[PDB]
Design an enzyme around this catalytic site. Structure first.
Site, PDB file in Angstrom:
ATOM      1  N   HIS A 121       0.875  -1.293  -0.189  1.00 42.87           N
ATOM      2  CA  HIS A 121       0.142   0.025   0.270  1.00 42.87           C
ATOM      3  C   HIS A 121       0.828   1.322   0.069  1.00 42.87           C
ATOM      4  CE1 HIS A 121       0.149  -0.573   4.546  1.00 42.87           C
ATOM      5  NE2 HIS A 121      -0.071   0.764   4.659  1.00 42.87           N
ATOM      6  N   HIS A 146       1.611   3.882   2.088  1.00 49.00           N
ATOM      7  CA  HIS A 146       2.151   4.578   3.194  1.00 49.00           C
ATOM      8  C   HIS A 146       3.833   4.545   3.416  1.00 49.00           C
ATOM      9  CE1 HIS A 146      -1.719   4.289   6.088  1.00 49.00           C
ATOM     10  NE2 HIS A 146      -1.829   5.553   5.328  1.00 49.00           N
ATOM     11  N   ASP A 184       5.846   3.404   5.446  1.00 49.52           N
ATOM     12  CA  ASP A 184       6.635   1.867   5.869  1.00 49.52           C
ATOM     13  C   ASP A 184       6.690   0.926   4.679  1.00 49.52           C
ATOM     14  OD1 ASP A 184       3.568   2.207   6.514  1.00 49.52           O
ATOM     15  OD2 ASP A 184       3.814   0.240   7.319  1.00 49.52           O
ATOM     16  N   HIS A 198      -7.296  -1.348   6.278  1.00 51.96           N
ATOM     17  CA  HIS A 198      -6.245  -0.659   6.871  1.00 51.96           C
ATOM     18  C   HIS A 198      -6.182   0.646   5.947  1.00 51.96           C
ATOM     19  CE1 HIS A 198      -2.576   0.951   8.259  1.00 51.96           C
ATOM     20  NE2 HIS A 198      -1.766   1.100   7.148  1.00 51.96           N
ATOM     21  N   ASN A 228      -3.469   3.616  13.147  1.00 51.20           N
ATOM     22  CA  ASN A 228      -3.640   4.740  12.411  1.00 51.20           C
ATOM     23  C   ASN A 228      -4.746   4.321  11.573  1.00 51.20           C
ATOM     24  OD1 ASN A 228      -3.747   6.695  10.696  1.00 51.20           O
ATOM     25  ND2 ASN A 228      -1.814   5.876   9.367  1.00 51.20           N
TER      26      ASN A 228
HETATM   27 ZN   LIG Z   1      -0.425   1.552   6.447  1.00 49.02          ZN
HETATM   28 ZN   LIG Z   2       1.556  -0.111   8.501  1.00 46.78          ZN
END
Ligand SMILES: [Zn+2]
Ligand SMILES: [Zn+2]
EC number: 3.5.2.6
Length: 223
Positions: free
Chosen positions: A82, A84, A86, A145, A176
């Site tokens: 995804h 994000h 990280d 998520h 989050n």
């Molecule tokens: Zn994420």
């Molecule tokens: Zn994550």
């Protein structure tokens, strides 16, 4: 006991699941707090393939350098699960080194929107890849998520990389949820459980490796 190998500060660690599959874990630093993140290293006859990069370019460069030296082959491909930091924070490093960065079109669309360099946008709802003898399936189960999160399945080992869709035992809340879809996330987990009825290990995006119970744990956190 599983082989674990670290860099000097312990900010990057690799842990062996089997002869050709390792989990990579890196510590990001945020407000003076260490925040770990997992992906996979696949040691294939045609190079190394990673599931996910890391928080930033410095960590991604160090991870690549560690695994290329240890396994004596090049990182050729990364699957980004995804958009994000990280997951995708090392995308600049990947592109400039000529490492192929696979993702869904939606992940690529979100990465662009957010100012990251773009991965390939080549992965569909189900995509089957093969690297040397290593088989990899990617699956988009629905929103959770994030709107774009995918899982990765290794059918030769029945190992699921749940990514950030799947919470570890140590996670006592959903974390989050700014970008999350908490009314759809249970259905997405159920889609994973329906597709993969026999699972040997599950790698969450953050925290300790577990098994199918991590999926059930995530369902419970969504109540
Ligand atoms: Zn994420
Ligand atoms: Zn994550």
């Amino acid at each position: 006991e599983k082989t674990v190998i670290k860099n000097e500060t312990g900010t990057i660690s690799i842990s062996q699941l089997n002869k050709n599959v390792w989990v990579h874990t890196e510590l990001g630093s945020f407000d003076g707090e260490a925040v770990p993140s997992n992906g996979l290293v696949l040691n294939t006859s045609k190079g190394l393939v990673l599931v996910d990069s890391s928080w930033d370019d410095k960590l991604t460069k160090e991870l690549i350098e560690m695994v290329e030296k240890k396994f004596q082959k090049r990182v050729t491909d990364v699957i980004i699960t995804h958009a994000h930091a990280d997951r995708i924070g090392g995308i600049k490093t990947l592109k400039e080194r000529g490492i192929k960065a696979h993702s869904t079109a939606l992940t690529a669309e979100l990465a662009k929107k957010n100012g990251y360099e773009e991965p390939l946008g080549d992965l569909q709802t189900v995509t089957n890849l093969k690297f040397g003898n290593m088989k990899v399936e990617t699956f988009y189960p629905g929103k959770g998520h994030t709107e774009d999160n995918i899982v990765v399945w290794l059918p030769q080992y029945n190992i699921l990389v749940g990514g950030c869709l799947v919470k570890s035992t140590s996670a006592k809340d959903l974390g989050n949820v700014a970008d999350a879809y908490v009314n759809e996330w249970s259905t997405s987990i159920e889609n994973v459980l329906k597709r993969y009825r026999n699972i040997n290990a599950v790698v969450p995006g953050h925290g300790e490796v577990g098994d199918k119970g991590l999926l059930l744990h995530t369902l419970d956190l969504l109540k």
